[PDB]
Amino acid sequence: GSLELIKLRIMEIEARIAKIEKDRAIL
Amino acid sequence: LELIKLRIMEIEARIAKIEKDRAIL
Amino acid sequence: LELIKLRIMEIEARIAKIEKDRAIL
Numbered sequence: 001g002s003l004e005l006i007k008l009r010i011m012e013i014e015a016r017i018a019k020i021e022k023d024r025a026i027l
Numbered sequence: 028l029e030l031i032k033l034r035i036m037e038i039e040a041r042i043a044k045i046e047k048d049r050a051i052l
Numbered sequence: 053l054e055l056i057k058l059r060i061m062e063i064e065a066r067i068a069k070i071e072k073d074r075a076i077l
Contacts (some may be wrong), residue, residue, distance in 0.1 A: 010059050017066050026052050041067050051076045
């Protein structure tokens with residue numbers, strides 16, 4: 001239900017942010 | 028939960044702004 | 053809701069770090 005969907009959206013956002021962080025790293 | 032859904036929407040909006048304004052993503 | 057709220061705070065802080073990140077170009 002709603003709690004499980006919130007958790008999925010959170011997971012998706014966490015991955016989204018992690019990708020940007022990795023992509024903006026100092027070389 | 029309603030407040031949480033609210034933060035989530037606002038979070039996605041900040042991400043969209045980043046995705047729009049930054050070159051390096 | 054406690055772990056969800058923590059995860060939201062952590063997201064927001066990480067998003068703040070991106071918003072205030074260096075301009076790479």
